[PDB]
RNA sequence: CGAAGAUGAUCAGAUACCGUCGUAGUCUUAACCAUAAACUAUGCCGACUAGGGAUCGGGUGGUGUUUUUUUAAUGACCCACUCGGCACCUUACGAGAAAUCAAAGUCUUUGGGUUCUGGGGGGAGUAUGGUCGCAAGGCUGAAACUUAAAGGAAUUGACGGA
């Protein structure tokens, strides 16, 4: 039973929500970080906190983890979420309106492309 | 001062609102009691009642106590607060902050003429909790406040000079007593007489007017 | 609604009722010149007729009585008053 | 206090309805209240299936089936684990499942 | 007592307490 | 009030039918029949896209009322709603809050998402009932999207729209960004088109 | 409409029906059957005078351990006999 | 039976001014009712109100504005003379200074403050605040 | 109210619902007071001026806020055919 | 099938539950009785107040499906209303001590009309008197005396051959 507790994890997620530009894949240089950058009172301590970093950095790797929140994140959502479509949707590839969406069309009395066809019902 | 959260909490301990009526004009929520410390400063409390409530286990009764608090000044504004804790000073001291949370206005008035200073209740007024009923009637001058003492106390420390009191349901449920009769002090403003009847040009809150004096940034 | 004008109502909505829930009741039924293709004279026949109406040319049917509105005996032209 | 407000039963109108017998206990209940299910089954089992094929002249024959309607006293179809007792808020469910 | 039980047993006192008067009677 | 220019194009009536925010639910409530014209067979409604164009230009002028815009809150818990909410939030002020709410946001003050807004825009007031909820207790008026079947309690401006489709949604609130925009200088005149397109207000797969 | 008539005319009703419901009450009863003049070994008095007949001790009821040193008396007036607790530490002693 | 058509009448009027809305429909109309109406009317704790003439008894649409608390019926009508009106007031009203107790009087259908300036009393019909 | 000698004695004259005119009191945490932007010519908002409403707890909570909204826009104008009198 | 009763087991006992029989009874005719947790533990009449969907009976309208085959009755079905019914679901405007309740709402802001019932628990539905019944019993119905609670709803716990 290998499951860690909330003082493994939740350092882990504190040194990631502050020291991503630092600590990498390698558990060896991030339990050398541990050192510096925090105060773990003991070794075993440390060695977890660095293995649950690491294994947390390589899940960051192939996508990003539900509640990690780094600075690093939001420009790499941000340029994937820039995307629009080229084909510009909502023009008109020829507008397929029906018989009361004609009638709602002409009520407001505004010039629109029509093609009334019946609900087949 | 306490540099807080709520963006009305920054406002009054700014200074943009120095008065408790705008809040109350503007319904207000005031989950901050330094607001209330500092609009009004000369708030009196009073311990009502301290009684112990008792929690069943696998093996002994879990005593916590509840306090009710009534913290009010004579012109016009009380508050009410049920806190119950492990112990009777914290109960009490968190009671006090509940209470100063919990601030009404009272719509004082006249029994009828309309010679100077309010000293009665506006209204007939009705408040229900639990299945106690308390009815306020407005009385004459120097009629006092005909009420059960924990009754005359809420209404002494709201400023009501003159009032009558009809009671029913079990009254000797203290809580339920003092919520109903803070209910029916609450409906005061809650009745439209006819000098409330002309249509106001409703106001700009400040939390519009002093938006940058508040949200901090 | 909570605001809503009781005194002009639509007449879908006027439509839409029973007849004593209008805003003024009154009936639905109507009364029907109705003609027998044997000859030109013209019976009014109420819509909801309860009785064998017979006219003096085709002196058997003119309706017959329904639970509701009378059905003409499917020769007869009808016209409304 | 009232448990429930079709009572334990289904009446709305009647006064009266008939009573039934339990399959398993002989207790009279009323057919509204009473707990029915329905049996059907194939007439032999799962099992010999291959077995009652592998005998029978006319092969695919039909493999007839059971049918049984069960009618349960409350107490009954409770120790049966039929109806299985629900919380206070789950037991206003009605669904078959 | 079942309340039941408990009338059922009024009724059997109540014919005793009528006989013993028309033995009187 | 509104001068000429804040009417119905033909070219925003093309976005709105060719998207179907003109259809409704099949069962209408009451308090959203108002919106309705002229049910079409099979079923569906038709909502009164004059009338949601007008709601919505009230609903920016509501937005482009409040001083600072950072607390003008955008929800949306379903996932049709939340790229479009991070995008309003992206070209108004505007707060976001996408996926989940955590009760306790605008009471319980010390929540690390403890937010004090001024007015709350929801995509659907069944998914997002929690924050319309408790608006209720912090005195917020709520801005919601609204479909025939949505519910009403605590909505002060229902914008009628397909809630039952991706587009009508992203569409939707493209318009109302795009409003809030021309009520003010980012957007400074009312006909040429926005170059940020409709179509990045649509969530995508996969 | 409440149960109980409203109309002008029903004060016959009201009335009557008051004047049955009354029965009910304790005092009421009591106090029209006259009972403290049938019952009531004190035939309507306060006091009454007796001649003592025996010293009783009488044990308390439970959870109360002792016993309380009263007398059985004859009423004077009437001949009833009653039974009279002899209230103060001693006081038995003082009675004969 | 229906017994009192002022009874439903104010009974439709008060569950429509406590859910919000500005307009009643009323049926059957009297004409002590329409009586009833124009002094809740000139005190101005309803607005126009129009009669519809059906040619059985009537149908009334009020406007309601926000300014009703209660207008209720005391019913049976009971006698009032002019001393005991005070009792009435005291026990209906809710302050001295606002809310009429309306009375009917050979001198007319009027409320207590209009029979005690013309000295006059009669019968309760109900009162309006 | 006021007293005899001038001196208003009020401690404050409540906002009235928009929509009911019922008074909108201190504890009613589910009424709003919403403000329009008043548009000038070529369509901005005027930074400061505002059409305010105000909406009580009792019709949010009903769910008639909204139709009130709509009438009350309407007849300042700030609608033009969104609400019928004739529903 | 089965009060009673036999009879076989069980059990410390078992004059009970279980098993086997089995009289009255269960059915009916002619009369009596007049009670039930006769319950929706919710009198009857009337009006108003919020949303929905299903269903039963009647009615109205589709130039709707089933007889799509040339300008294709009716019944049956579908859609939309409508009145009346048995109910249901959501909400709580409201009500309540709560459970819950579209009535158990429109109640201290207390009056639509009307009938019946109750006044702490027992003693007691007892005694007595009257009256009805063949009877069993029914209907009406106390008091002396006694008592500080009995009760209702919900909570936590503990316990359960759940
Ligand atoms: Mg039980
Ligand atoms: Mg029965
Ligand atoms: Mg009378
Ligand atoms: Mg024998
Ligand atoms: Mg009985
Ligand atoms: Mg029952
Ligand atoms: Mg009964
Ligand atoms: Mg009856
Ligand atoms: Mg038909
Ligand atoms: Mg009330
Ligand atoms: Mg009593
Ligand atoms: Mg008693
Ligand atoms: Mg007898
Ligand atoms: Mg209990
Ligand atoms: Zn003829």
Redesign the interface.
Same mark, same amino acid.
């Given at each position: 039973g290998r499951v860690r507790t909330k003082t493994v994890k939740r350092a882990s997620k504190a040194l990631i929500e502050r020291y991503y530009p630092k600590l990498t894949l390698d558990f060896q240089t991030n339990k050398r970080l541990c050192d510096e950058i925090a105060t773990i009172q003991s070794k075993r301590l440390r060695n977890k906190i660095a293995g649950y970093t690491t294994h947390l950095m390589k899940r960051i790797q192939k996508g990003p983890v539900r509640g990690i929140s780094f600075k690093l994140q939001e420009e790499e959502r941000e340029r994937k979420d820039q995307y629009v479509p080229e084909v510009s949707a909502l023009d008109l590839s020829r507008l397929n309106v029906d018989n009361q969406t004609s009638d709602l069309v002409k009520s407001l009395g505004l010039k629109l492309p029509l093609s009334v066809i019946n609900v087949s019902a | 001062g306490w540099v807080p959260?709520?963006?009305l909490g920054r406002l009054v301990k700014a200074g943009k609102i120095t008065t408790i009526?705008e809040?109350? $004009?503007?319904? $207000?929520?005031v989950?901050?009691f330094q607001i209330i410390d500092t609009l009004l400063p000369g708030l009196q409390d009073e311990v009502m009642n301290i009684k112990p409530v008792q929690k069943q286990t696998r093996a002994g009764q879990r005593t916590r106590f509840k306090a009710v608090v009534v913290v009010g000044d004579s012109?016009?504004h009380v508050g009410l607060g049920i806190k119950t804790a492990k112990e009777v000073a914290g109960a009490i001291r968190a009671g006090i902050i509940i209470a100063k949370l919990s601030v009404?206005?009272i719509?004082r008035?006249?029994?009828?003429t309309?010679?100077?200073?309010?000293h009665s209740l506006?209204?007939?007024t009705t408040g229900k909790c639990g299945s106690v009923t308390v009815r306020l009637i407005?009385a004459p001058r120097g009629s006092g406040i005909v009420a059960s003492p924990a009754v005359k106390k809420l209404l002494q420390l709201a400023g009501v000079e003159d009032v009558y009191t009809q009671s029913n349901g079990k009254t000797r449920t203290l809580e339920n007593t003092l919520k109903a009769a803070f209910v029916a002090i609450?409906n005061t403003?809650?009745?439209?007489?006819?000098?409330?009847?002309a249509?106001?040009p409703?106001p700009?809150?400040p939390?519009?007017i002093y938006?940058?004096e508040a949200?901090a940034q | 609604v909570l605001v809503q004008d009781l005194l002009h109502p639509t007449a879908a909505s006027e439509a839409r009722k029973h007849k004593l829930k209008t805003l003024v009741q009154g009936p639905r039924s109507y009364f029907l010149d109705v003609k027998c293709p044997g000859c030109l004279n013209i019976t009014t026949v109420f819509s909801h007729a309860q009785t064998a109406v017979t006219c003096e040319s085709c002196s058997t049917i003119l309706c017959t009585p329904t639970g509701g509105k009378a059905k003409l005996s499917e020769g007869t032209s009808f016209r409304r008053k | 206090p009232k448990k429930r407000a079709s009572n334990g039963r289904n009446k709305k109108g009647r006064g009266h309805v008939k009573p039934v017998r339990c399959v398993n206990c002989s207790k009279s209940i009323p057919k509204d209240k009473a707990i029915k299910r329905m049996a059907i089954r194939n007439i032999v089992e799962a099992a010999a299936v291959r077995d009652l094929s592998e005998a029978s002249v006319y092969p695919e024959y039909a493999l007839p089936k059971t049918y049984n309607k069960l009618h349960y006293c409350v107490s009954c179809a409770i120790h049966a684990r039929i109806v299985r007792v629900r919380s206070r808020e789950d037991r206003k469910n009605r669904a078959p499942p | 007592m079942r309340a039941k039980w408990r009338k059922k047993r009024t009724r059997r006192l109540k014919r005793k307490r009528r006989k013993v008067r028309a033995r009187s009677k | 009030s509104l001068p000429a220019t804040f009417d119905l194009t033909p070219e925003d009536a093309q976005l709105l039918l060719a998207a179907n925010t003109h259809l409704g639910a099949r069962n209408v409530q009451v308090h959203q029949e108002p919106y309705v014209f002229n049910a079409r067979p099979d079923g569906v409604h038709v909502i009164n896209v004059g009338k949601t164009w007008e709601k919505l230009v009230l609903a920016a002028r509501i937005i482009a009322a409040?001083?600072?815009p950072?607390?003008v809150v955008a929800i949306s818990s379903r996932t049709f709603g939340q790229r479009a909410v991070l995008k309003f939030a992206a070209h108004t002020g505007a707060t976001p809050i996408a996926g989940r709410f955590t009760p306790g946001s605008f009471?319980n003050?010390?929540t690390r998402s403890?937010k004090?807004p001024?007015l709350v825009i929801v995509t659907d007031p069944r998914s997002d009932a929690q924050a319309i909820k408790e608006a209720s207790?912090?005195?917020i008026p709520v801005i919601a999207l609204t479909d025939l079947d949505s519910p009403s309690e605590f909505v002060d401006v229902a914008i009628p729209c397909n809630n039952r489709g991706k587009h009508s949604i992203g569409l939707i609130w493209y318009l109302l960004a795009r409003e809030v925009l021309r009520l003010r200088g980012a957007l400074v005149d009312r006909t040429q088109p926005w170059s940020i397109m409709p179509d990045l207000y649509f969530y995508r797969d996969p | 409409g409440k149960g109980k008539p409203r109309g002008l005319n029903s004060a016959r009703k009201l009335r009557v029906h008051r004047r049955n419901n009354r029965w009910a009450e304790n005092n009421y009863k009591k106090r029209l059957l006259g009972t403290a003049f049938k019952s009531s070994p004190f035939g309507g008095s306060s006091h009454a005078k007796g001649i003592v007949l025996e010293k009783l001790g009488i044990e308390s009821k439970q959870p109360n351990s002792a016993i309380r040193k009263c007398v059985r008396v004859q009423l004077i007036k009437n001949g009833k006999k009653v039974t009279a607790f002899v209230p103060n530490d001693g006081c038995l002693n003082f009675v004969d | 039976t229906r017994s009192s058509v002022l009874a439903d009448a104010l009974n439709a009027i008060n569950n429509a001014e406590k859910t919000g809305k500005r307009q009643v429909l009323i049926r059957p109309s009297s004409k002590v009712i329409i009586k009833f109406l124009q002094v809740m009317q000139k005190h101005?704790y309803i607005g126009e109100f129009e009669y519809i003439d059906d040619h059985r008894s009537g149908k009334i649409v009020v406007q309601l504005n926000?300014?009703l608390?209660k207008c209720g019926v005391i019913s049976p009508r009971f006698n009032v003379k002019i001393g005991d009106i005070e009792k009435w007031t005291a026990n209906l009203l809710?302050?001295?200074?606002?809310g009429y107790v309306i009375l009917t009087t050979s001198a007319g259908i009027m409320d207590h403050e209009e029979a005690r300036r013309k000295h006059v009393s009669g019968k309760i019909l109900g009162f309006v605040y | 109210?006021?007293?005899?000698?001038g001196?208003l004695?009020?401690?404050?004259?409540?906002?009235?619902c928009?929509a009911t005119?019922?008074?909108?009191?201190?504890?009613?945490?589910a009424?709003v007071?919403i403000?329009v932007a008043k548009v000038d010519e070529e369509g901005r908002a005027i930074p400061g001026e505002?059409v305010?409403?105000?909406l009580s707890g009792y019709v949010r909570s009903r769910g008639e806020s909204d139709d009130s909204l709509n009438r009350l826009a309407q007849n300042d104008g700030l609608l033009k055919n969104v609400w019928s009198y004739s529903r």
């Open positions: - | 959260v709520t963006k009526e809040i109350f $004009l503007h319904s $207000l929520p989950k901050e012109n016009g009404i206005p719509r008035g006249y029994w009828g309309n010679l100077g200073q309010p506006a209204t007939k407005p609450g403003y809650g009745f439209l007489t006819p000098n409330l009847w249509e106001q409703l700009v809150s939390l519009d938006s940058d949200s | - | - | - | 409040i001083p600072n950072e607390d009471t003050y010390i403890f004090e001024r207790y912090v005195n | - | 101005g926000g300014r608390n809710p302050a001295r200074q606002f | 109210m006021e007293n005899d000698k001196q004695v009020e401690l404050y004259v409540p906002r009235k928009s005119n019922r008074i909108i009191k201190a504890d009613d945490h009424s007071q403000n505002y305010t409403y105000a």
